Write a protein that binds this ligand. Structure first.
Ligand SMILES: *[C@@H]1O[C@H](CO)[C@@H](O[C@@H]2O[C@H](CO)[C@@H](O[C@@H]3O[C@H](CO)[C@@H](O)[C@H](O[C@@H]4O[C@H](CO)[C@@H](O)[C@H](O)[C@@H]4O)[C@@H]3O)[C@H](O)[C@H]2NC(C)=O)[C@H](O[C@@H]2O[C@@H](C)[C@@H](O)[C@@H](O)[C@@H]2O)[C@H]1NC(C)=O
Ligand SMILES: *[C@@H]1O[C@H](CO)[C@@H](O[C@@H]2O[C@H](CO)[C@@H](O[C@@H]3O[C@H](CO[C@H]4O[C@H](CO)[C@@H](O)[C@H](O)[C@@H]4O)[C@@H](O)[C@H](O)[C@@H]3O)[C@H](O)[C@H]2NC(C)=O)[C@H](O[C@@H]2O[C@@H](C)[C@@H](O)[C@@H](O)[C@@H]2O)[C@H]1NC(C)=O
Ligand SMILES: Cc1cc2nc3c(=O)[nH]c(=O)nc-3n(C[C@H](O)[C@H](O)[C@H](O)COP(=O)(O)OP(=O)(O)OC[C@H]3O[C@@H](n4cnc5c(N)ncnc54)[C@H](O)[C@@H]3O)c2cc1C
Ligand SMILES: *[C@@H]1O[C@H](CO)[C@@H](O[C@H]2O[C@H](CO)[C@@H](O)[C@H](O)[C@H]2NC(C)=O)[C@H](O)[C@H]1NC(C)=O
Ligand SMILES: *[C@@H]1O[C@H](CO)[C@@H](O)[C@H](O)[C@H]1NC(C)=O
Length: 521
């Protein structure tokens, strides 16, 4: 764990605007996307080799409010002008969502909750994990940007409700994803300063690592067939000028553009379903049927209460973990401008007083959709994505159980003081939005609630799965010098909150690559 301090921007010494980067550069490794996995991956590789990270967004300093906990909602409320750190999008299901567009990636705009992955998920992942390395990597990340949170009144109230509602056992303070209630770590420190993946760049070698911002990577360049090999990438700067970055012998291009960005770049580069690419006149480098397939987004269902007596804003630290759903509560100040993605659509009531958001995330999820291009040539145009929420009925069954548990929390002595009326059961609260069914035994009513009030938990993943597009070493099959390392690689969420796993993944693969190079020397 780290100790409270200012956000470390020492890496700014080797950060350049794409306009200032050479038109044609040569490096050992080129990483597309300076995000959650991308930054630690880049820093790790820079320990011995020349690395170039290309990020489409700005430096965090360009948007000060991404640096504090008090700015979380603010960033989501800001209008998307194409340059802001929060890029807005709407799934084909009709659910509002957002993704990061800034150095540090989505770790720069998230809710800060930090958890280590469920220790039982490594065996069925399709990857043979070096667990000693995994834990060493978690420690490396934690010692830099993870903190033990201060106590917060509302989070403590939530903890009492979870324990009263049977979410057992109590783990006290713990970073591990385990069934029960606990206070976990946060990437926000004790003064409210946000720490993120960009700071992991400081762990790299300042003489071997170079970061390019405002760099839009449009295509991966490949050698002639057979024996296809990625040779570099083409990126464009703010002046519309295209640049090229190539990789040297034994070097590699690694895509860490995220669940949305990675499949998009692969498709635009000619790596994807043959008939799909040909239908758009995109030359096929290699037919890869599953690029953009198996996109998963865990549904978020919730209940907003408006306490008669004001509660204070808090950062999420208390988690109530069940095997099929994960829960927590967020307390916030009122607002007239809605934070995009918080509520599923723009037609939702606004809170004019403080409120508490009780959220429930379905595990998995089992349901999935796909990603397709909206533009066959412009990487700056968001891809179309559909998640097919609740297409798998087991996900729905878990939502029902999860919302019934929320019903239990609302019926605890712990939450009684926050009701406006003495009403029994889950009744008596001033609710903002769709209320829970009164009858806690009416499954059909809960299914309707689940379907009509669903929102995104923003933990979407998949699209370039290990075993479908990648091999156990994260290499894109059929192509040399090309890997994918970010949230697009697995079908199920690693924990209630995935950033910990994705941060770890970046350095983990980085070390595996260095170990491979060491053996090849
Ligand atoms: C919602 O998600 C659930 C959970 O994932 C789906 O249910 C699972 O569906 C799987 C099939 O896609 C089942 O796996 C099969 O199970 C049988 C029985 O054990 C097994 O024989 C199959 O194995 C085959 O043979 C080899 C093994 O000897 C194997 O190497 C082959 O590759 C081949 O698979 C295979 O493992 C799961 O058992 C099942 N889980 C549960 C708990 O039911 C569900 O899928 C639907 O419902 C299923 C019951 C089944 O009818 C399936 O066809 C349906 O699609 C998902 N629902 C939806 C709408 O997709
Ligand atoms: C990689 O890191 C993980 C954690 O992310 C290691 O797993 C942890 O290992 C520690 C040390 O063995 C465990 O701590 C002990 O836990 C027991 C039981 O705690 C549980 O039950 C009590 C109730 O009695 C609850 O209060 C707790 O909250 C918890 O639910 C406790 O009695 C001891 O005093 C220690 O605190 C820890 O539980 C465990 N966490 C998880 C999620 O597994 C992992 O270590 C390996 O696996 C564990 C289970 C042991 O077998 C170790 O010997 C292994 O090394 C580590 N892996 C590696 C390779 O180092
Ligand atoms: C609002 C919100 C709140 C969240 N809250 C939490 C939380 O509290 N705890 C938690 O654990 N998780 C949380 N998450 C999820 C977690 O933050 C993400 O799952 C994780 O950051 C994803 O990491 P990634 O590396 O895959 O992608 P990203 O961090 O998004 O990184 C991909 C990077 O690639 C860049 N990029 C994309 N395309 C291109 C291109 N063509 N050229 C150049 N650069 C490109 C992007 O700008 C971005 O910086 C939240 C997510 C959201 C959106
Ligand atoms: C941790 O990960 C495991 C493995 O993915 C999850 O699944 C286990 O628990 C389920 C619920 O009881 C069982 O039905 C599964 O058979 C079992 N899977 C295996 C192979 O062990 C587990 O639910 C996760 N735990 C939490 C708290 O999320
Ligand atoms: C504000 O709160 C009052 C409660 O007195 C409620 O009647 C009203 O609808 C709310 N207004 C908005 C815009 O949320």
């Amino acid at each position: 764990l780290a100790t409270t301090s200012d956000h470390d921007f020492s890496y700014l010494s080797f950060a350049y605007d794409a306009t200032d980067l050479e038109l044609e550069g040569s490096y050992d490794y080129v990483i597309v996307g300076g995000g959650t996995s991308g930054c630690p991956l880049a820093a790790t590789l820079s320990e011995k080799y020349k690395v170039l990270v290309l990020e489409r967004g700005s430096l965090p300093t360009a948007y000060p409010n991404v640096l504090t906990a008090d700015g979380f909602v603010y960033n989501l409320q800001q209008e998307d002008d194409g340059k802001t750190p929060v890029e807005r999008f709407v799934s084909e299901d009709g659910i509002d969502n957002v993704r990061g567009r800034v150095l540090g990636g989505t770790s720069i705009i998230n809710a800060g909750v930090y958890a280590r992955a469920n220790t039982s998920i490594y065996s069925a992942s399709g990857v043979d994990w070096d667990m000693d390395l995994v834990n060493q990597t978690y420690e490396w990340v934690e010692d830099t940007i993870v903190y033990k949170p201060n106590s917060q009144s509302w989070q403590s109230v939530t903890k009492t409700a979870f324990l009263e509602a049977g979410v057992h056992p109590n783990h006290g303070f713990s970073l591990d994803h385990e069934e029960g209630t606990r206070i976990t770590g946060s990437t926000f420190d004790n003064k409210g300063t946000r720490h993120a993946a960009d700071e992991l760049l400081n762990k790299g070698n300042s003489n071997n690592l170079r970061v390019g911002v405002h760099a839009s990577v449009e295509k991966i360049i490949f050698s002639n067939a057979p024996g296809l090999t990625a040779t570099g990438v083409i990126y464009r700067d703010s002046n519309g000028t295209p640049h090229q970055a190539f990789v040297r012998s034994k070097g590699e291009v690694i895509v860490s553009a995220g669940t949305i960005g990675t499949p998009q770049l692969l498709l635009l580069s000619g790596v994807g379903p043959e008939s799909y690419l040909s239908s758009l006149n995109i030359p096929v480098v290699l037919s890869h049927p599953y690029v953009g397939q198996f996109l998963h987004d865990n549904p978020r269902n919730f209940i907003n209460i408006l306490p008669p007596n004001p509660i204070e804003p808090t950062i999420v630290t208390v988690l109530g973990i069940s095997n099929d759903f994960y829960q927590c509560s967020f307390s916030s100040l009122p607002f007239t401008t809605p934070p995009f993605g918080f509520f599923p659509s723009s037609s939702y009531p606004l809170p004019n007083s403080t409120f508490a958001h009780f959220a429930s995330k379905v595990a998995g999820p089992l349901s999935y959709g796909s990603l397709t291009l909206k533009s066959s040539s412009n990487v700056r145009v968001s891809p179309n994505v559909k998640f097919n929420y609740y297409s798998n009925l087991t996900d729905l069954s878990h939502c029902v159980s999860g919302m019934k548990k929320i019903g239990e929390l609302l019926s605890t002595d712990a939450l009684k003081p926050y009701k406006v009326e003495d009403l029994p059961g889950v009744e008596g609260f001033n609710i903002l939005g769709i209320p829970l069914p009164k009858d806690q035994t009416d499954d059909a009513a809960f299914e309707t609630f689940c379907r009509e009030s669903v929102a995104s938990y923003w933990h979407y993943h998949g699209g370039c799965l290990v075993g479908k597009v990648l091999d156990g070493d994260f290499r894109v099959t059929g192509i040399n010098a090309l890997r994918v390392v970010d949230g697009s690689t697995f079908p199920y969420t690693p924990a209630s909150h995935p950033q910990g796993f994705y941060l770890m993944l970046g350095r983990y693969v980085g070390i595996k690559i260095l170990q491979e190079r060491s053996a090849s020397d």
